[PDB]
Amino acid sequence: AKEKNAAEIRQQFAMTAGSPIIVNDKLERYAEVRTAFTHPTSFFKPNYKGEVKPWFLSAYDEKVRQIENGENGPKMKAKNVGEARAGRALEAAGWTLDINYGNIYPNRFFMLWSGETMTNTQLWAPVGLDRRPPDTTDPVELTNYVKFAARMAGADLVGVARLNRNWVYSEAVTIPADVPYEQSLHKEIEKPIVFKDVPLPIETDDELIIPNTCENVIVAGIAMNREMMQTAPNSMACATTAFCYSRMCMFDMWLCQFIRYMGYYAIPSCNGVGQSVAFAVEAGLGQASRMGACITPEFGPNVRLTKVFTNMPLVPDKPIDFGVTEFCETCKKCARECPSKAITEGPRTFEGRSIHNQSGKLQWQNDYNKCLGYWPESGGYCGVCVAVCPFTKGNIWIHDGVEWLIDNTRFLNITEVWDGKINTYGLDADHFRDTVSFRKDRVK
Amino acid sequence: AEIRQQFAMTAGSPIIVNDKLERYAEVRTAFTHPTSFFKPNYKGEVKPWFLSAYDEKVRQIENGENGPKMKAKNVGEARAGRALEAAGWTLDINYGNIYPNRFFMLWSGETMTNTQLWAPVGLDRRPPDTTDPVELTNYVKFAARMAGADLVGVARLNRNWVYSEAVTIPADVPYEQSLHKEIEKPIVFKDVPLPIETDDELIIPNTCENVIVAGIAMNREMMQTAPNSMACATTAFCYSRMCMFDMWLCQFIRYMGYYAIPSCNGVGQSVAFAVEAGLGQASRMGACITPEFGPNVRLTKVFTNMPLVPDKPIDFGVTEFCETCKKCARECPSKAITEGPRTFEGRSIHNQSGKLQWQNDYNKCLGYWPESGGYCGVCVAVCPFTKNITEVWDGKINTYGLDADHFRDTVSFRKDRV
């Protein structure tokens, strides 16, 4: 006659301890300014009138053009102008709790490295939870507590790894502390991230200082909505992306406060501080893939990541190998469907394709300037590679009577989305049992 | 979805009122009123009630307890429950976000970082492209589910449930002085284009036709630990879910060409709005009891001129069940809940007289919070419609504390949205 079981799947494919990422001697920490979103070589893109602008402003011009022409995406006619409008209103509102598309500035706005000034900390100050020494130092108990809190805080997946500094940005993109929001985009700077023998995360005029005791990284997966992502590259894919960034932000703040009130310190990050995919792989959420994302058993790549760094003692999780690398070796669906041909069809190498790649680690090397170039053209955040990946299909797992396996057969419109199935936070009750959690699967 | 249609009433507010009903000044709630605000701690020192409750939380942690007379596994566990509770409140100002047009509860999006970033697109400046209330109701409910509501309904705004005067703070007062500088400010309805605040008044436009009410489900296993710390924790986390819902949904409504007023625990009485919007029925304890969650669900609401189709109120027999049940009243640690019949006369200043309801003594309720060091919730926990702490921490959990064994009950398609 067997119903899907993520705990069994993860146990079946668990590896022995050790970072799965393969590196050589060319590896150096990566300056965040090099990402396509920020680097001068990629930052500017033409709009549909040929005017060269910051990429997100050129994308804005295309969003406005599509609404006026009753389109939900590039050459994709909406039911009417009102439907086109509704999709961009949903997208825009999803970003409500996110600063400048990613919350990357460390220790600014929502991403504070200390809780001292937050209104919640001030209200609770008489209890002294953030000043009382920890009552628990046992990593086993702390891992159970912090993972339970993580699920409360909106994570669909949570894992723990030792912090690998190779993936922490050599220098962050940030703004001076005295610069108000309305000037932030004009006053962005770089600032080194360094590790020193200090008791608490602290920021000087010159440096963002992470303590040498910052042992661990907690990684969260924030599930996006399948029906909406499958509209990629059209507006509804932008909306599930946007809403999950605000979920990421709430997660980080909730969890950091929990960790602080347990007597440790905690650094939030969302898209800042370090490379989420690498942390997620080392924390066992999933495997790296040809497109470059972390592919998870539960959601494929259709899941966002955030992470929190802490000195709280924790038990690292085991990495997972459910065969993604070998599937990506033969699949190439994302490479073939990518509207900008940004994804390589070749083998993995240690050699960066351009400045946006960190050389010295074995991965599929993609041209992320080509990817970013398609966003102003399509007026969105694309996501076609996520949408076409077979691992994004909700039912890829089958049980053969003995064990779990991937179904190889899987590798061979917006009005209906607005009118169709939805549930709280865009989660799907047909799959929400995938992420049920008991102590047995939080810590062994 | 068929249960709720099975029990739909015809249109019309189910709340029975008389000639004496008047709008209720928010200062009168037990949380804020000077007759109920100060309570002794366990040492006998009289303080603001939440400060006396803090002292009990400290004392329990030190004594390795999760609640009154309830030993924890160890001090570490006691600490963890209070750390979780305190963290849950991260996105909430001074227990409830009640000050209108302050902090998270802004009546205009114009100064929000999100609005500024999106300004070149001009979605908040562009006239509505959709005025059909049917399509708007489908769009905004879909948005509401994305925004974290497990239940959503629409009603015409009954001004009887809007506070006559809000509790707020002067606009330039910093957060650190807020608790000490709370003031009263009238909420009035005038012929103005947009919601606006003057030195003297919070002005809601006469065009503000509708209220959208959201139900935000709490975790059943955690609330079952009431009056102990883990029921405090699911309470707290849902207040921050409430705040994110309000901001997300207001931004959606504004980017659609309308205005939107958030509220969380402020602006007006959530239980009344929820009953008129069809989420559930009023109950003996005073809460809105829903078919999906019983009373184990928090409420928030957003006010807007967006054309919408009002939902029908529902009758699935709560009133007749509450007549004979009285379990909440017998389990209530403070004897706050009446065993008697419904009347139009409030028992004290904390009740709004003029509406038929079970009249409860809410000062007796609040008095149990400093004694127990939490937000109680025993009434919610024992209610039949709702159906140790180490086992909760070691037991089932899922995203936002939702439960996959019941999450299918809140699936939604267009047919059940409008």
Ligand SMILES: Oc1ccc(Br)cc1
């Ligand atoms: O991950 C993302 C970052 C920025 C934008 Br805009 C969209 C997606």
Ligand SMILES: Oc1ccc(Br)cc1
């Ligand atoms: O007087 C006080 C009021 C509130 C807090 Br919190 C601390 C002190």
Ligand SMILES: Oc1ccc(Br)cc1
């Ligand atoms: O509704 C609530 C208001 C204040 C507290 Br403290 C807890 C719950």
Ligand SMILES: Oc1ccc(Br)cc1
């Ligand atoms: O020059 C700018 C105009 C609008 C934005 Br948003 C950012 C920069």
Ligand code: SF4
């Ligand atoms: S589409 Fe195919 S090659 Fe691309 S990431 Fe998914 S499985 Fe790998």
Ligand code: SF4
């Ligand atoms: S987001 Fe789009 S353009 Fe970018 S890699 Fe994926 S498919 Fe290609």
Ligand code: SF4
């Ligand atoms: S919260 Fe507790 S004290 Fe208050 S009415 Fe309910 S049972 Fe009684």
Ligand code: SF4
């Ligand atoms: S416990 Fe009984 S009387 Fe009290 S609200 Fe629930 S059903 Fe009604």
